């Protein structure tokens, strides 16, 4: 084997699985989903003694989710998954990327955005934006940002938001709303008044989408890791002896709700 050395020794035999998903979405103003996909990588941090063959299993089609197509680290017997749905491999030591993958079916959209806009005459905008967290409530979304674009003839913006904090970054012609943490199945809202300058009347505005960024401790695809079995047949340790850890990091990618 060219990627792993033969005499590795660890007193403490531990491994760490990271499911890393970028979720991506474009939503019409009426709540219909125009496009959606997940890019995911699975990264393994492994400290295992010797040369262990590992079998890695998830919910490839409790639940069952449907992976569309994926690609593996060379270390994986491609044919061992080509007739049994069992990903098998001897891992490299240290950190490495076991697979990347993509997912479009039956996604979990961590947040729904409900924009509401009202034209108080040629001078004001009245605007409310509600976000709903749509995941298990024992879980905390963190690093929530709600970017609300503003017009170019803007002459000041007052806002109220009971949760979070909100600047008007006029350099970027948008309102940034920032929320440190939010639990699942919750509603938070922001209200804004957008004082306006007169503008060339014909030259008119098309509300660009409201974009979000967020991090959530679960895989939006619905993927869930089910086993990482470790067999090492020359050495007097076995599976019960390995200390195992999983974590999920679903990040936003393109996450635009259309106004």
């Amino acid at each position: 084997i060219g990627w792993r050395r033969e005499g590795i020794k660890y007193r403490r035999n531990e491994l760490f699985l990271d499911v890393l998903e970028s979720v991506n979405l474009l939503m019409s103003p009426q709540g219909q989903v125009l496009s959606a996909h997940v890019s995911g990588r699975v990264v393994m941090k492994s400290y295992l003694s010797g040369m262990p063959e590992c079998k890695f299993g998830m919910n490839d089609k409790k639940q069952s989710i449907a992976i569309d197509d994926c690609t593996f680290h060379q270390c994986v017997r491609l044919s061992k998954f080509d007739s049994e749905r069992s990903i098998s491999f001897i891992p490299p030591d240290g950190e490495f990327e076991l697979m990347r993958y993509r997912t479009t079916k039956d996604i979990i959209l961590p947040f729904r955005v409900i924009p509401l806009v009202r034209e108080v005459g040629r001078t004001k905008l009245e605007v409310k934006v509600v976000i709903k967290s749509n995941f298990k409530p024992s879980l905390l979304a963190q690093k929530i940002e709600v970017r609300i674009p503003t017009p170019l003839n803007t002459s000041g913006v007052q806002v109220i938001c009971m949760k979070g904090k909100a600047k008007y970054k006029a350099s970027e012609n948008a309102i940034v709303w920032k929320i440190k943490r939010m639990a699942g199945m919750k509603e938070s809202q922001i209200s804004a008044e957008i004082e306006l300058l007169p503008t060339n009347d014909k030259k008119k505005w098309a509300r660009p989408p409201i974009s979000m960024n967020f991090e959530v401790p679960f895989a939006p695809s619905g993927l869930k890791v089910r086993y990482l079995k470790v067999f090492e047949p020359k050495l007097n340790y076995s599976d019960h002896d390995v200390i195992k850890w999983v974590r999920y990091i679903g990040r936003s990618g393109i996450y635009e709700t259309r106004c």
Binding site: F16, P217, V225, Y227, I243, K244, W245, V246, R247
Partner: peptide, 6 residues
């Protein structure tokens, strides 16, 4: 966060 595997 890292949870153990059950």
């Amino acid at each position: 966060d890292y949870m153990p595997m059950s």
